[PDB]
Design a protein around this ligand. Structure first.
Ligand SMILES: CCCCCCCCCCCCCCCCCC(=O)OC[C@H](CO[C@@H]1O[C@H](CO[C@H]2O[C@H](CO)[C@H](O)[C@H](O)[C@H]2O)[C@H](O)[C@H](O)[C@H]1O)OC(=O)CCCCCCCCCCCCCCCCC
Ligand code: CLA
Ligand code: CLA
Ligand code: CLA
Ligand code: CLA
Ligand code: CLA
Ligand code: CLA
Ligand SMILES: CCCCCCCCCCCCCCCCCC(=O)OC[C@H](CO[C@@H]1O[C@H](CO)[C@H](O)[C@H](O)[C@H]1O)OC(=O)CCCCCCCCCCCCCCCCC
Ligand SMILES: CCCCCCCCCCCCCCCC(=O)OC[C@H](COP(=O)(O)OC[C@@H](O)CO)OC(=O)CCCCCCCCCCCCCCC
Ligand SMILES: CC1=C(/C=C/C(C)=C\C=C/C(C)=C/C=C/C=C(C)/C=C/C=C(C)/C=C/C2=C(C)CCCC2(C)C)C(C)(C)CCC1
Ligand SMILES: CC1=C(C/C=C(\C)CCC[C@H](C)CCC[C@H](C)CCCC(C)C)C(=O)c2ccccc2C1=O
Lengths: 83, 740, 217, 226, 41
């Protein structure tokens, strides 16, 4: 919440890591399918200038995932007495 | 892919089909000629699978019928709120809930029934209600009758809106088959919106309205002097005084410092000593966590945006080596058959109702709910019976799906085919398990009764002679008593008082206390398991042998609901799956009757009572440890020791319970003539009456006929269930109101 | 007198049974009543008698209230029966049953003229043949129309339209009488003077009824 | 440019609508949705466009009526007692009610509901039956209610008495600008309601607070964050 | 109207009408004649 707080830093890092994972393979996305690996799919939604398969629902889903991972990490570290 | 598919005006709103009673089926479209047509009019009314073979029309009818049932439910809820608004002493009950009985039904003085308006207290006369609506309204922050009036008017408005919605979504804008088949969208919207959004809205109401009103009520201030909920909503000074964390003003939520919300979102597991109910802050954090979990779960399935899970892909992927085609054709089955979904919904709804009853007697989630013993007993019994009816209807509609909607082409080597392929082994093993359970439980009871009648108390299976103590249940109780100690250290106390601890009492009456488990408890628990096993065996034999059997190889062609196949092969009476459900209904009734008898006796002997300086004096003095081990103990110390209030209720406000008890005995006895006998006797009797009316030239044009064998069985089981249910209802309510 | 006639709502489709022949036919029928010709005749007769009694009662109420406001000792239209049989030579019971006996003849003659048109004017009642014959469904005429301005067809139609419009207006006037006497407990003329004295303040919203006041803020 | 146009949504809509930026993620302009005859459901393209333009006009009027009193009362144009916040006029008596009015607020509500019921019921009857309000005599202004083929743009001697847009290009530009300003005012009234709930002040006061201190007065600082 | 009238002319609806009529008649008789047992004019 506070600018410069450790929770802000690590949750911004988590959201950016989720976005970077969605941009380049890694995390499954709209254009990524199949259970074991990730395979190319239909474009589904126009990306509106974004290269590769990166649409609005992609950034919405992975921002939600990043916020969830960040709040889980924050509360887990607060439970164990860490940052 | 997922989109709204709606046809515009497929059915015109005309009264021309209201004049013709039999119109949905071609068999009844020809008009009536015998009286068995009339029953057939009231039997195939909701059999939409038989009226048309088109799944789209059936789905539209199902949607409209669900809207109608929601409208009926909202009408009933609005009427309940209106009765609480006008013909009730809720305002008087709020001043002293431990001395004024809850009353919300008032009778008209016409023929001497005004004696039913008993002295409930607070300057009011009426019937002592056991629904617990007073405690629900106290948990919702309702103070004045104006709020109940507003809730009733809003309920009537929403009921009219739902009734118009059913008319619109059937006659005007009827959804197509592709709209109903979007199971992924339905699941996502139900998990996120129906359950999660409602949980979040109720959590917000508990935070902003229910918690301050309940805190001020527990403080002991006048309910008339309590500020209105909108004052808590708008002005922040009162909510800051009652809870300092509200002075932050949503700062800890968006800064992830949620521990600052710990004052009004607590984890003090247990019972509130002021009111004997669950902590409202605990319920607020509970519903908030449930809402968060359900909004997380509602984004699981793929609908229109690529990401998500496919139900068909998940079902086809989960295949093992011992099962062949693991869960292969189930997605096509559950997206085309309404009866399979009905069976699933009814089974899960009934099991969840049983869970609700158990976890509601265990933790009373309402202020001044545990002190009202009658409310708790009535709620437990009601949810118990509704759950049992739902789980037997699950087997009924599963058998209906087996007869009608099963396709062998889509089921070659899948799980359903293998279940049908070893159904005989399933039924044989279940029969052996049921017989062994019934022997080693009921024969144990008979052993105790015999050795009691033979003067051998040391030979009995009691708490003093042969200790067959429930060591697993006692170990689990001890572990859950230590759950806040080591495994859940953030909880202030135990999650419930049933595991152990101290005695919580309100107004001199014990709200909750630890429950000891002995040999009688083990005996009745194994008896319940045996009865459930037998009912499961009956319903599973009905479901699995619904299509074919060794006795009848072409049972599928005879339909789901047929009386018999003649006296051939020795006799094929009651061989249909419908007759199996009709037989299992009695076993469900017996099982739940024994369960509620165990609940009533155990909580009257070891839970409920009064609290004095010497200790806790229970209602029956704790005879369950020494009387529940024999059938004669239930006969004398539970059925004869109680039920004296029912028979002595004449001349008082409880006399309607005695009259209802007698009427229930009457209906239960009257059911036996339909359960026994047959059809030819009554048919010839009706022929003689036809001759009598023909002598006087008053023979009706519609030929009177005897009830069908299936119809006679249905009438018998319905009157039998109604008689037994109302007998237990009257006995329980009269006993728990007079002495409770 | 039909087809392109002003309706209750501009653009709404008029009902098939409401062709505009009847007086005051604005095609107003949300519940689709009076579809059958016999049901239409019964509804027309009921509307006509309700209209005549409503206009008579509203005129009497207005005259009594105007005289009371002018200074004449007349009671309010509400609870006038109490002082009425307090000062009546005829007590209650006898008066209402005498009224019922006097009304039964007229009501049953109206009913059997509605069921059988022209059957009353056959000399059965004091040898009257030309009179006591219904000119129309709900419009008897004869001795009930002493002066003959209903002989002209166009004049009769205009009189029917005027009568049904003033009847509907008097129906709403009587409903308003009941409503604002239950709301204000004053005479309708008192409500009229209060409305024309301070129109900007005195209205249906300042009586303490109709609109509820809970928070008072 | 198409502002965030979702793919597979252009398959059923071409460029005929004024805005028509191709943004339809869930999908409601599809002719397959509510296809048939008669009244049908409420999700049809004609009613969708009609409700969109009516929401646009109402939101534009609301944004104007929320800005003008506060802005003119900040200066000497509007006196201070009449320069109340838009939610403190009496629309929400918990928020605030202006007692010094020429009539009671419920009397004004009754006059308003009668007038707007006449207006919107005539509008609805013309929507169901085009040109029907010009036939039945209303006051003599029936020729002013002639309407057009599109119910969203009736025109006539009163609704468009300036007869702007003689050419089709000017009609298209005017319709696009109307729907754009209406969508902007819809988002504006959304923000106005949000600020009224959170800040409890007028939108111009919130704008001045953001202007004076950007970081010290923003959405993050509104709810307690830093 | 006539279709709704024939719906009201069906046996359950007229039976319901008879039920309310008879029940209301007996209830009003019992209310205005409180608890009689023997016919004594
Ligand atoms: C419901 C839809 C929104 C309705 C309100 C629209 C915005 C508005 O006019 O908002 C203004 C009103 C008035 O609330 C507050 O009202 C205050 C005035 O109260 C004054 O007077 C009060 C009198 O009791 C108190 O004394 C109070 O302390 C005092 O300040 C100030 O004007 C605040 O700026 C103002 O926010 O808001 C309210 O009614 C708040 C109502 C909140 C309901 C839930 C809204 C949605 C929440 C998210 C879920 C989606
Ligand atoms: C998040 C959105 C949402 C919500 C809240 C609901 C809610 C509901 N659905 Mg629905 N459903 C949805 C989306 C949603 N649906 C979608 C997208 C589909 C298509 C895939 C379906 C398909 C569907 C079927 C096929 C059926 C339901 C049924 C039901 C009801 C279940 C009974 C119950 O729990 O009573 C809860 C009751 C209440 C809480 C009382 C208030 C109910 C209000 C009026 C509903 C308001 C939510 C509504 C969806 C808003 C949109 C409607 C709007 C145009 C007016 C419930 C009202 C069943 C039904 O017909 O019930 C009538 C049923 O058989 N749903
Ligand atoms: C569904 C549940 C729910 C609801 C309705 C509320 C609602 C509220 N809570 Mg609560 N709260 C909740 C859950 C909920 N909360 C939960 C789960 C927690 C976690 C512990 C809290 C914790 C909490 C705290 C600690 C506090 C509140 C406060 C508030 C108020 C502030 C609202 C606000 O700023 O939000 C944001 C609201 C908006 C952005 C407004 C929505 C946008 C509007 C509606 C747009 C309208 C536009 C429209 C078109 C124009 C108007 C139309 C008109 C012209 C006709 C409000 C009454 C605070 C309070 O009471 O002080 C005032 C407070 O101190 N709540
Ligand atoms: C109290 C009466 C009674 C009794 C004893 C039984 C007994 C039985 N029924 Mg049931 N049943 C009853 C009433 C009863 N029924 C009624 C009223 C209905 C109508 C709804 C049904 C409907 C019904 C169905 C639908 C089914 C059964 C089944 C069964 C069997 C389950 C075996 C078991 O678990 O217990 C074991 C048996 C006992 C505990 C009997 C008690 C007697 C003593 C303890 C046994 C020893 C006696 C003595 C020591 C030996 C004497 C030897 C010599 C002198 C004769 C068993 C034969 C099921 C079945 O076939 O098997 C699973 C089944 O599917 N019954
Ligand atoms: C008779 C069975 C039973 C019941 C009803 C309970 C009930 C409870 N126990 Mg206990 N427990 C049991 C047996 C039982 N226990 C046996 C042991 C020994 C191993 C324990 C050891 C134990 C400890 C050590 C603790 C509890 C605690 C608790 C409480 C919370 C538990 C919880 O969060 O569950 C989860 C709650 C849910 C609602 C989850 C339900 C999930 C539903 C049913 C769907 C499940 C689908 C499933 C995942 C699919 C199967 C997958 C599979 C194929 C792999 C609750 C009162 C805790 C306590 O003290 O209370 C605060 C605690 O600390 N229990
Ligand atoms: C942001 C959440 C969200 C999302 C992604 C969806 C997505 C979807 N819904 Mg749902 N819906 C939502 C919220 C949401 N809805 C809410 C809050 C309600 C209650 C008012 C509904 C009520 C609803 C119904 C009744 C139906 C859908 C249907 C649909 C599908 C297409 C129509 C559409 O775009 O919605 C348009 C509908 C809306 C209410 C717009 C919500 C936009 C949010 C608020 C942003 C699509 C899978 C349809 C479907 O699946 O048919 C098979 C369908 O019949 N939804
Ligand atoms: C069980 C709940 C349920 C479900 C699943 C539906 C589903 C549907 N309804 Mg229905 N509806 C419901 C309850 C429900 N409705 C109720 C309770 C009412 C009465 C208030 C209506 C009144 C209604 C009308 C009048 C219309 C629909 C329409 C629709 C369709 C549009 C779906 C959509 O885009 O989201 C809903 C879209 C929204 C913008 C949601 C608005 C919700 C706010 C709160 C209002 C869809 C088939 C429309 C249709 O058939 O067109 C295809 C249509 O014209 N419904
Ligand atoms: C169009 C229009 O205005 O229709 C307005 C509608 C129907 O209006 C008319 O109705 C007639 C039948 O009565 C015919 O169908 C006409 O064609 C139709 O225009 O009028 C209503 O009152 C709507 C229905 C209200 C009741 C809905 C109940 C739905 C079932 C819930 C249980
Ligand atoms: C008591 C009831 C015993 C039933 C034993 C057979 C279960 C049915 C059966 O054959 O299950 C076989 C099953 C292993 O089968 P698969 O792993 O191939 O099943 C995978 C698919 O279900 C997907 O074993 C178990 O579930 C172990 C526990 C049984 C309990
Ligand atoms: C590179 C680039 C760029 C940038 C971009 C960006 C920077 C973005 C971002 C984005 C973002 C940054 C987003 C986010 C989102 C988020 C979200 C969506 C989240 C969440 C939500 C919610 C609603 C939540 C909830 C919750 C709660 C409350 C509780 C529980 C848990 C959770 C967390 C789940 C640009 C354009 C310039 C250019 C080009 C490229
Ligand atoms: C008695 C009996 C009959 C005969 C029962 C018949 C014909 C049903 C009679 C139902 C009556 C007509 C219901 C209505 C009774 C009253 C006339 C209605 C209430 C009257 C009061 C309100 C005055 C069967 O047909 C039968 C069939 C199969 C198994 C068992 C039996 C069985 O036991």
């Amino acid at each position: 919440g506070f600018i410069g707080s450790p929770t802000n830093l690590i949750m911004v890092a988590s959201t950016g890591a989720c976005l970077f994972a969605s941009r380049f393979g890694l995390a499954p996305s709209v254009r990524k399918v199949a259970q074991p690996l990730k395979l190319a799919d239909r474009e589904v939604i126009q990306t509106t200038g974004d290269p590769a398969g990166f649409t609005a629902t992609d950034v919405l889903a992975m921002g939600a995932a990043g916020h969830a991972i960040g709040v889980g990490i924050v509360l887990g570290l607060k439970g164990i007495g860490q940052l | 892919k997922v989109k709204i598919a709606v046809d515009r005006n497929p059915v015109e709103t005309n009264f021309e089909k209201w004049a013709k009673p039999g119109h949905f089926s071609r068999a009844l479209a020809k008009g009536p000629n015998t009286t068995t047509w009339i029953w057939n009019l009231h039997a195939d009314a909701h059999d939409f699978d038989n009226h048309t073979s088109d799944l789209e029309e059936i789905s539209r009818k199902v949607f409209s019928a669900h809207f109608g049932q929601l409208g009926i439910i909202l009408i009933w809820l609005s009427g309940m709120y209106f009765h609480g608004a006008r013909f009730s002493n809720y305002e008087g009950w709020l001043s002293d809930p431990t001395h004024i009985k809850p009353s919300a039904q008032v009778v008209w003085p016409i023929v001497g029934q005004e004696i039913l308006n008993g002295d409930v207290g607070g300057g009011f006369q009426g019937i002592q209600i056991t629904s617990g609506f007073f405690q629900l309204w106290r948990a919702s922050g309702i103070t004045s009758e104006l709020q109940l009036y507003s809730t009733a008017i809003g309920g009537l408005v929403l009921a009219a809106a739902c009734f118009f919605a059913g008319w619109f979504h059937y006659h005007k804008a009827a959804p197509k088959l592709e709209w109903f088949q979007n199971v992924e969208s339905m699941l996502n919207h139900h998990l996120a919106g129906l359950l999660g959004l409602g949980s979040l809205a109720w959590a917000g109401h508990q935070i902003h309205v229910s918690l301050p009103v309940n805190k001020l009520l527990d403080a002991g201030v006048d309910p008339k002097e309590i500020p209105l909920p909108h004052e808590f909503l708008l002005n922040q000074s009162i909510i800051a005084d009652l809870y300092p964390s509200f002075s932050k003003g949503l700062a800890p939520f968006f800064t992830l410092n949620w521990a600052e919300y710990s004052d009004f979102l607590t984890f003090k597991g247990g019972l509130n000593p002021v009111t004997g109910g669950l902590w409202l802050s605990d319920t607020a954090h509970h519903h908030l966590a449930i809402a968060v979990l359900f909004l997380v779960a509602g984004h699981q399935y793929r609908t229109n945006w690529g990401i998500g899970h496919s139900i068909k892909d998940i079902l086809e992927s989960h295949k093992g080596p011992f099962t062949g085609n693991g869960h292969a054709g189930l997605y096509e089955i559950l997206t085309t058959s309404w009866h399979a979904q009905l069976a699933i919904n009814l089974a899960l709804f009934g099991s969840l109702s049983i869970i609700v009853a158990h976890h509601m007697y265990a933790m009373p989630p309402y202020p001044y709910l545990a002190t009202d013993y009658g409310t708790q007993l009535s709620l437990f019994t009601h949810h118990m019976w509704i759950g049992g009816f739902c789980v037997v209807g699950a087997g009924a509609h599963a058998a209906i799906f087996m007869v009608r909607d099963y396709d062998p082409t889509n089921n070659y080597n899948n799980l359903l085919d293998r279940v049908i392929r070893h159904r005989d082994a399933i039924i044989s093993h279940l029969n052996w398990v049921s017989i062994f359970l019934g022997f080693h439980s009921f024969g144990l009871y008979i052993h105790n009764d015999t050795m009691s009648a033979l003067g051998r108390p040391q030979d009995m299976f009691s708490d003093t002679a042969i200790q067959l103590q429930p060591v697993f249940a006692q170990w689990i109780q001890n572990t859950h008593f230590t759950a806040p100690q080591l495994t859940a250290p953030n909880a202030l106390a135990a999650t419930s008082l049933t595991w152990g601890g101290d005695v919580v009492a309100v107004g001199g009456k014990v709200a909750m206390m630890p429950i000891a488990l002995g040999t009688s408890d083990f005996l009745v628990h194994h008896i319940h398991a045996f009865t459930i096993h037998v009912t499961v065996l009956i319903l599973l034999k009905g479901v699995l042998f619904a299509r074919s059997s060794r006795l009848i190889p072409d049972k599928a062609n005879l339909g789901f609901r047929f009386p018999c196949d003649g006296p051939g092969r020795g006799g094929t009476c009651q061989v249909s799956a419908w007759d199996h459900v009709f037989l299992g209904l009695f076993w469900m009734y017996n099982s739940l009757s024994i369960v509620i008898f165990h609940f009533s006796w155990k909580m009257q002997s070891d839970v409920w009572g009064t609290v004095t300086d010497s200790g806790v004096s229970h209602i029956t003095g704790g005879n369950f440890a020494q009387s529940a081990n024999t059938i004669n103990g239930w006969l004398r110390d539970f059925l004869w020791a109680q039920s004296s209030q029912v028979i002595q209720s004449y001349g008082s406000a409880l006399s309607a319970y005695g009259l209802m008890f007698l009427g229930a005995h009457f209906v239960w006895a009257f059911s036996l003539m339909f359960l026994f006998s047959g059809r030819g006797y009554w048919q010839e009797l009706i022929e003689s009456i036809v001759w009598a009316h023909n002598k006087l030239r008053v023979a009706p044009s519609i030929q009177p006929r005897a009830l069908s064998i299936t119809q006679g069985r249905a009438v018998g089981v319905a009157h039998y269930l109604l008689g037994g249910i109302a007998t237990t209802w009257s006995f329980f309510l009269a006993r728990i109101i007079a002495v409770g | 007198a039909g087809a392109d006639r002003p309706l209750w709502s501009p653009g709404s489709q008029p009902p098939a049974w409401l062709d505009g022949s009847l007086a005051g036919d604005y095609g107003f029928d949300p519940l689709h009543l009076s579809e059958e010709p016999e049901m239409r005749k019964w509804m027309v007769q009921a509307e006509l008698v309700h209209a005549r009694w409503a206009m008579l009662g509203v005129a009497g109420i207005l005259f009594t209230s105007i005289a009371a406001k002018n200074g004449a000792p007349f009671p309010d239209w509400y609870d006038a029966g109490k002082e009425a049989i307090k000062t009546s030579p005829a007590p209650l019971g006898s008066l209402i049953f005498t009224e019922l006996l006097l009304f039964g003849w007229v009501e049953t003659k109206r009913l059997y003229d509605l069921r059988n048109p022209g059957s009353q004017g056959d000399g059965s009642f004091l040898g009257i043949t030309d009179g006591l014959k219904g000119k129309e469904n709900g419009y008897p005429g004869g001795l009930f129309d002493p002066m003959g301005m209903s002989k002209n067809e166009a004049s009769f139609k205009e009189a029917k339209v005027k009568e049904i419009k003033n009847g509907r207006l008097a129906m709403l006037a009587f409903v308003g009488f009941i409503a604002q006497h239950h709301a204000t407990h004053k005479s309708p003329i008192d409500n009229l003077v209060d409305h024309v004295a301070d129109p900007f303040h005195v209205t249906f919203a300042t009586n303490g009824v109709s609109v509820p006041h809970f928070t008072e803020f | 440019l198409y502002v965030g146009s979702d793919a597979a949504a252009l398959k059923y809509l071409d460029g005929t609508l004024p805005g028509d930026y191709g943004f339809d993620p869930l999908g409601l302009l599809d002719p397959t949705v509510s296809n048939g005859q008669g009244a049908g459901g409420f999700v049809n393209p004609r009613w969708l466009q009609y409700s969109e333009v009516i929401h646009a006009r109402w939101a534009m009027l609301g944004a104007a009526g929320c800005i003008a009193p506060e802005i003119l009362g900040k200066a000497g144009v509007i006196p201070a007692e009449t320069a109340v916040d838009w939610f403190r006029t009496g629309v929400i008596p918990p928020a605030g009610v202006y007692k010094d009015f020429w009539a009671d607020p419920f009397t004004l509500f009754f006059i308003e509901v009668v007038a707007i019921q006449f207006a919107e019921l005539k509008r609805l009857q013309d929507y169901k039956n085009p040109g029907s309000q010009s036939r039945q005599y209303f006051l003599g202004l029936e020729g002013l209610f002639k309407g057009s083929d599109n119910p969203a743009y009736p025109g006539g001697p009163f609704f468009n008495f300036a007869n702007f847009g003689k050419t089709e290009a000017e009609m298209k530009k005017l319709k696009l600008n109307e729907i754009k300003n209406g969508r902007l005012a819809m988002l504006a009234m959304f923000g106005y309601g949000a600020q009224a709930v959170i800040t409890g002040d007028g939108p111009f006061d919130n704008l001045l607070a953001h202007l004076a201190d950007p970081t010290g007065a923003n959405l993050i600082t509104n709810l307690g964050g830093k | 109207m006539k279709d709704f009238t024939t719906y009201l002319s069906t046996a359950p609806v007229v039976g319901l009408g008879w039920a309310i009529f008879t029940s209301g008649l007996l209830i009003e008789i019992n209310r205005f004649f409180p608890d009689p047992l023997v016919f004594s004019f």
